[PDB]
Symmetry: D3
Subunit: 260 residues, 6 copies
């Protein structure tokens, strides 16, 4: 559909990467309800696209997402927040089966840091900054800003970032484990698109199985996690993609996958 | 009160930071029963102080805490450990609701490293060292020296430090995620006090809710953790400090919080 | 017994370290059925050796283990993999009670990285590389390559390595926490042997208790983990090595341990 | 919309109970795609109805639901099932916030038993029968027929019912804990409607909080469950309904609740 | 310390059973703060008594405990509950190491059922009734009335009792598993005292270990539960009472235990 | 091999049921090392038999298994027990993939009750009794007598049985959920054999998947349990038995399963 807050298009060769770019530069990509609706529409459109195998989520060069709109949430009481479940459409990225690579350039504060952490892979620029300033306005992060952050960077750094609201550099996020790669500002999007192309070049079903196996590490114990990983490695044998890849490996050539 | 092992006072402007400094320099701040009792009393006093919003725990410049007294625990038998629940008052720091910042200077060995890891934020000096030498005397760390350490720095480094008892530098704890900031020895205490002042400047109830949400990341799954975070974010709306902070954000000014 | 794929011997002074060296240099130490059988035989032999306290697992100078044989697993189906529990002998290293130090030199790809992550301590060379290329042949890592990796290095880096199959340097693994020490290619084995000698010098039963307490951090919550740690610290008092070590600490001398 | 497989209406005095009755008597209420879509639509309509406080789900007098259609799932392969998440709309009843009372009359086999167990309260007739015959056609229950059943009736009875497919009487389900009340066949619907009216008479928000607290018992440990229960009990104090109820208890009268 | 709400005495031969009888017959044993304080004092006194090995908690013949005083909690806000942690002294019974047998006669409503479920063994009379009427006053049970209840009687019956507030007979509680034995009203206390005497006649430390092993079933998985059970069965060997009991079993006689 | 403590044979028509009968009537089937070794040998022999689909474990008419040999473990210490892992060969029944039906007749005390609870289905005679008398000799059940028992029969009854050692009748175990069916002592074995034949007639791989899905209910949460159940129900589509059974159901006939 015609979006007014975001820009959705297919990038890279073979058109296998879906680029969802936030286009709110005057508000520093403020996460409003309309922007979230357009983002979810683009996400489901890219998920229902057979040619797309990976999604790249990015905002602006100076700001990825500076948090939710506060004026629409100031006059909310406890009843209207508990009932009606206020930030519920804020977790549709966690239900996406295809990998979503976050290209964080500039400010990723409040809701932006949570939306980035909800993605599988986070690519941060040279001047990218992460913070959780919810404590400054009398609230707490309520979209994964504490659960995923503490699991990623540890208790101490997450406790400091949550209780103080201070910002951390991209280098600190890489050393702590929040992001997996640091790229220049003018080439972050291109490297994220190349990584998404490398991801989508494989079998989509096996990639989804691997993503589920990785995500299960935060929901189950080590023994049950290993058992589920063994069951998934057994189940991946029932696909033609596994046999095709093993044939291309034994008889050295390029593997032609058909997502089945 | 008349303390013989620790020094308790309120530091910083407006006296919002409680400083609990171990005062056993000739014994390398050995964690004895009287010192633990005085630490618990000071923690309770600072918890029951409305003007205190954060606590800073520190020791000496050359040693933070070099472990418990071995003489008072050699004659102890298996039955006398289980019954009297040996080392039962060593986890009172985990029951505090206000944030406690550990300013570790010098040696933090055995019980000292566990007491530091039990704090929310760990500030270490340039010459600070962390180790678990329990394996050297025929015992294992029994106050969180294995659970929290493995969750913070990983399996490999924790296994090495536990089975070998070797010391790690402050830079190692920083790159591994054990500590959150490296500060000079002459200014570590003041930087910890400034961080505790920045923490106490916010709403104490919202800060405690955020601390609980962060601590829940080690006790529940990611889904249930996110559900509890959502419930806490919804409950935050029932406080006057939330509305005050959101109004101060809307009309740009300084938010005056009343801890309610 | 006489091995054809591996080399098993006791190294170090006092013969306290068991060295299991993979001896398949022309196949990059491919994890085959015979190699796994010989590895399990050497592991149980060293476990049934009262003079051995720690095991060092290493491969070649240019490759630790470059994955399993794809030829013996290409013609496998879903039923044959499930009704035979494929790769069920691949986790015998996780049942070892004595510490196992992984001296990873060169390539550790696929099954190699999984076998290395199952060890307690991972020692990597300067030119050591870790990767999970299973996604390139149409399968997923099914021997702990996702559960342990995501817990160690984090969500983002593990997701990238799994979905892309790209390699990471030893420095990246050290920064992310996958390995614990970087050593030269010419001395990595000697450093691992010295670490295993320092480990075996302590009480083997107390060392096993500490290893169990550390491993329990990935199978239980923080509260139950601390409770089990307290119970193990209480049970360690019923050993003769505990009082001997405490007496040697009180009256400064060398503690003579008898593994009881 | 106009339903062809189910009947949706508001029953009972004050029209606070939504009755969703399956209307496929010739197919023993086979769970097809259209019937599931209509059930989800009726559930959403009753959820978005302020005048409805509870839902009652029932079928026919001789059969509640005899499982899904096997014809629409025989020609399905593994890839079509996985890459489309077969039976994904079958768990929309677990996302409902208002209590759903299952009035099971007659046969509740496989999918019917799963849909009944997914409800909060199960009301069964004297001639009601429960079974999981999936093992007879070469499959396993895949909509909670093993997880919830084993947690409700125990390990032994669930194992027997799953591996044998034998039916159990309503008295057996009552003594095992599967159902909570046995009612005559001619009055089961009326008793379920009266129970839902007793439920709908209370505060909807407090009822939803209690439902969440009860459902959390199967998602985490007892300690975290009690902590979440304490937090929800504290959050209840921010509603006007709790104050109104406590005031009506003090000054003995009927409490007028407004769902806020 | 003379009590005004409860009666504390030692009953049974050898004076090994501590009887804590609620003595509020006009208020149906309303759980007030003073009664809770006296109960905690009696509990800690009986725990610190070497002659007492088991505790029996009971109220009146017509009422065990009819819930907390609503007048004390009527004028309480959300901030006053959270901060201050309302009902925080209500879980001191869960920290008792010695077994506590609940002799429930008459009404056990609201806080009474929660206090009874926190006991290890629950003994109910012929006319004993259990209910959770918190939903009738606009609140939810906040002292374990949902977590333990759902784990004991199942999902359906607990959901019904919570959302409706209806009472269940002692027979239904025995069938669902809430209680373990039904006794006449005039002899319930005597049978509970006899059971507590049978319990206290064994080794107190082994009894505490068994209680911990049983309570761990709700805090860990089956694998980790069995592991902790194995570790505790190994740890019980280091006590003299284990060897004494085994000697009395081999050489048939009466075992003389010394709680060590 | 020729057994001296047990009797192993194939019973029932088509020889699809393996009967492992304990043959120690003069010692009340005491669980000794040789008996456990022969039991494990018969179990692995029946597991490696393609014609056997289910195993029936029974003892004598007056005693199923009266616990382990006491004189075999009187002179054992804490170190000898921890380091040798006492009772480790006792959980080989939990690793069996095919269902094991426990035909418990007579006394099932101590280790016998644990071995019975480790089975999937428990069939008890009219005069069968279950108890955990470990507390009477100064020890605790260390082979699943507390974890599985508390999960099956509840907290109160398991606590009573563990702390008192009293016996429960077969009817009590049936109403509590410990056993699934009560049968006469003269026909219990035949009924268990008929049940195993009904189990063995189905697809062995699908039966193993169902057993795994049921056993996973005690190792994971409800959400992850349902996810693993969905994944197993998707994987079962890749078997030939699923399509054969579905075709036999569509066109009504007898399904011919080939265990593939
Ligand atoms: Mg890290
Ligand atoms: Mg039951």
């Amino acid at each position: 559909a015609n979006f007014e807050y975001i820009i959705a298009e297919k990038r890279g060769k073979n058109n296998t990467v879906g680029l969802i770019q936030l286009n709110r530069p005057k508000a520093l990509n403020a996460l409003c309800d309309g922007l979230i609706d357009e983002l979810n529409q683009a996400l489901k459109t890219f998920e229902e696209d057979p040619a797309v195998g990976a999604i790249v989520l990015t905002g602006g060069d100076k700001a990825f997402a500076a948090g939710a709109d506060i004026k629409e949430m100031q006059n909310l009481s406890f009843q209207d927040c508990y009932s009606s479940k206020f930030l519920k459409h804020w977790d549709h990225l966690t239900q996406v089966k295809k990998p979503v690579i976050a290209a964080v350039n500039g400010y990723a504060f409040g809701g932006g840091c949570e939306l980035a952490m909800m993605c599988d892979i986070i690519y941060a620029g040279e001047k990218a900054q992460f913070a959780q300033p919810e404590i400054l306005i009398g609230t707490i992060p309520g979209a994964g800003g504490t659960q995923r952050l503490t699991r990623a960077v540890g208790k101490s750094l997450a406790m400091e970032m949550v209780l103080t609201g201070d910002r951390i550099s991209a280098q600190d996020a890489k050393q702590a484990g929040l992001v997996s790669k640091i790229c220049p500002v003018e080439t972050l999007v291109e490297e994220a698109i190349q990584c998404a192309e490398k991801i989508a070049s494989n079998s989509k079903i096996v990639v989804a199985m691997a993503k589920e196996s990785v995500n299960a590490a935060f929901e189950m114990t080590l023994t049950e996690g290993s058992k589920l990983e063994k069951k998934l490695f057994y189940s991946t044998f029932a696909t033609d993609d596994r046999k095709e890849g093993m044939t291309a490996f034994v008889e050295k050539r390029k593997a032609n996958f058909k997502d089945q």
